[PDB]
């Protein structure tokens, strides 16, 4: 039973990767683009971009292990461990040619180790709205002169004593609605219907727990990225970020310049953290343009 | 009903102050010293210090407005507004002579405005284990290489949409256990019974809400203190801080040097954030010695 409506011309399928049953939605013809979603969402965040990319590409959008309809990882939740599943999934559909990668939110955390380790496999790279896990995240403030910061959840989710699961169980929709809307500039695109779809999905107990394990593994990911980042990224890369309340602002491009040689960036005015939902028309335009040159 | 046991030789009483019924515990003879508790506790956190100070002073330990057995404030929850209530209460018992002040945790937030506005009314000052609200708190990190920071609750409690009450109500015993133990170096002093008593007091609905309004007023308190801090503090002052997991460390005395000219500081090794409970023997000695000189 699908958790979200599949777009016309696309198929919802499963594929075993290192013993893990992964869910993905696939469509189109041509070179492969893999779209990797982030926290609080599923593959479905890409459902407006997918039918547009499918005119020129083979598009695959998987659910991260443990989220959506993908089984939890069997190894762990650090970026290096999750990257194995996403790399092997993609190479099963593009084993002979490099493929393109679009990632958002913790989709970046779970792909950067694969990108850096298999650079010949990645033709072009689009990263949007998330820091690569490294020492900079230790400088985000807990509290601001504007009020609640948008990053206090790092500690909330990573806390021991099962703090997040216990506090959110029975209040998943309420928490997720506050979490999404407080990181958004355009709140009206988050309908009550859409919020319920996402809420139901991540309220599955193994999905609620998997969600927090990513943040619980963040310190491990930072140590991993410290070694990997000694190799800079050589493929063409583009960063997208929102310039409104809740967006990453100039941070996105600035951090990426330390990782990539060939990077161009855009900051979208009036957009928050959820670019595919908040600013679909501009964001889709930039992505389709970048992947088509 | 009393919420906590009164030390033998002390009285639990109430007193109306600007239309708000405040609860306090009073005992002893001599000059007045006021002990002001912080979040997650009540007047009862002073119950070990109280019988010793009472041999030389008249000791009053109130419940902050809205917490313990005190009615909520009628004005607001910023430091300036709450400091009005504590000042008049103290002036009611020492209208002719200055008094002494010991404050802890958000007890500092709710007295500093009174101290700076009525320096003549305060003979000696002891501040322990809390920042004075100013821009420095905007620099505490949201997340650390050690895991969850101890200050992300600033944003959690401050969040709109009644996020903290909605998630915590009915789970006070679980949440308070984690909150206190994660800020303590000595957790075993928080017996199952003491956590039950505090959780019962904070599960009164108006008290859970009052708790978070202090944090929701914190930005106002910072703006208030920026003007107030133009007058340095004249009286003798002492800072106490824990040097173990969860203590303020060197920050307590360092920040106080920007507010006070006559300040001595102590960092208690092996002690976390709840000094009156975690390190009663060393802490009481320093307070008794400082207040008796």
């Amino acid at each position: 039973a699908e958790e979200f409506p599949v777009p016309n011309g696309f198929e919802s399928a499963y594929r075993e990767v290192d013993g893990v049953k992964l869910h993905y939605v696939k469509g189109g013809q041509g070179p492969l683009v893999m779209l990797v979603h982030g926290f609080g969402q599923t593959w479905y965040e890409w459902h407006q971009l997918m039918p547009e990319l499918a005119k020129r590409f083979t598009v695959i959008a998987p659910d991260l292990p443990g989220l959506g309809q993908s089984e939890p990882p069997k190894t762990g939740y650090s970026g290096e461990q999750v990257a194995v599943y996403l790399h092997k999934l993609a190479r099963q559909f593009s084993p002979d040619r490099p493929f393109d990668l679009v990632a958002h939110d913790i989709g970046i955390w779970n792909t950067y180790p694969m990108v850096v380790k298999n650079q010949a496999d990645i033709a072009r790279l689009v990263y949007m709205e998330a820091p690569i896990p490294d020492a900079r995240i230790y400088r985000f403030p807990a509290f601001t002169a504007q009020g609640e910061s948008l990053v206090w959840h790092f500690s909330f989710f990573a806390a021991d004593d099962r703090l997040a699961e216990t506090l959110i169980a029975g209040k998943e929709r309420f928490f997720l609605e506050h979490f999404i809307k407080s990181h958004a500039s355009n709140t009206e695109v988050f309908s009550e219907r859409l919020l319920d779809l996402y809420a139901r999905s991540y309220a599955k107990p193994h999905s609620l727990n998997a969600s927090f394990e990513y943040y619980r593994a963040l310190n491990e990911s930072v140590r991993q990225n410290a070694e990997l980042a000694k190799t800079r990224l050589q493929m063409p890369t583009m960063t997208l970020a929102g310039g409104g309340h809740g967006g990453m602002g100039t941070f996105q491009l600035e951090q990426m310049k330390a990782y990539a040689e060939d990077v161009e960036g855009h900051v979208l005015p009036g957009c928050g953290h959820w670019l595919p939902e908040e600013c679909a028309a501009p964001m889709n335009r930039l992505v389709i343009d970048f992947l088509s040159r | 009903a009393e919420e906590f046991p009164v030390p033998n030789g002390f009285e639990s009483a109430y007193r109306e102050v600007d239309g708000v019924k405040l609860h306090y515990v009073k005992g002893g003879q001599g000059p007045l010293v006021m002990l002001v508790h912080g979040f997650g506790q009540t007047w009862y956190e002073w119950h070990q210090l109280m019988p010793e100070l009472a041999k030389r002073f008249t000791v009053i330990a109130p419940d902050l407005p809205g917490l313990g057995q005190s009615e909520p404030p009628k004005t607001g929850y910023s430091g300036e507004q709450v400091a009005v209530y504590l000042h008049k209460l103290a002036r009611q018992f020492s209208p002719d002579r200055p008094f002494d002040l010991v404050a802890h945790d958000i007890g500092i937030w709710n007295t500093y405005p009174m101290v700076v506005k009525n320096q003549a009314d305060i003979a000696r000052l002891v501040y322990m284990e809390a920042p004075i609200p100013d821009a420095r708190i905007y620099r505490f990190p949201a997340f650390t290489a050690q895991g969850e920071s101890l200050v992300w609750h600033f944003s959690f409690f401050a969040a709109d949409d009644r996020l903290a009450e909605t998630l915590i109500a009915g789970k006070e015993r679980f949440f308070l256990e984690h909150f206190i133990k994660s800020h303590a170096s000595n957790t075993e002093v928080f017996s199952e019974r003491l956590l039950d008593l505090y959780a019962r007091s904070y599960a009164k609905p108006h008290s859970l809400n009052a708790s978070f309004e202090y944090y929701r007023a914190l930005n106002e308190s910072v703006r208030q203190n920026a003007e107030l801090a133009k007058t340095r503090l004249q009286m003798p002052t002492m800072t106490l801080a824990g040097g173990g997991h969860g203590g303020m460390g060197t920050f307590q005395l360092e920040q106080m040097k920007a507010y006070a000219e006559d300040v001595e500081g102590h960092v208690l090794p092996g002690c976390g954030h709840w000094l009156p409970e975690e390190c009663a023997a060393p802490m009481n000695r320093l307070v008794i010695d400082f207040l008796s000189r």
Partner: nanobody
Amino acid sequence: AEVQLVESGGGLVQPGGSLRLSCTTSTSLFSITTMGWYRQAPGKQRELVASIKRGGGTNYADSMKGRFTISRDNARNTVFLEMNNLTTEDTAVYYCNAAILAYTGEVTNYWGQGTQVTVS
């Protein structure tokens, strides 16, 4: 710059009189964490008059409620400052501010062009 602010209003008013200041944003007001009015008198510091958070919460600096009222019009992306019962002490240059909180906790400020209000 992510956001452009276009202020208008101001001028010379008699004591007791009234004025309305305006500021328009190039982006939606819900994309801006806080909108604010600040003023600066000759030889003095720029001080807060009033704020309105994107969720609608208002904040006044001490002793400003009485003379000022902040409001917005989300359809026109415009924030307003209504000045009532003005006095000589209200003579100042009045500025509009847009503060944006980024995901990282960084705050960016954008300012409108100052406008002179003289009470005489």
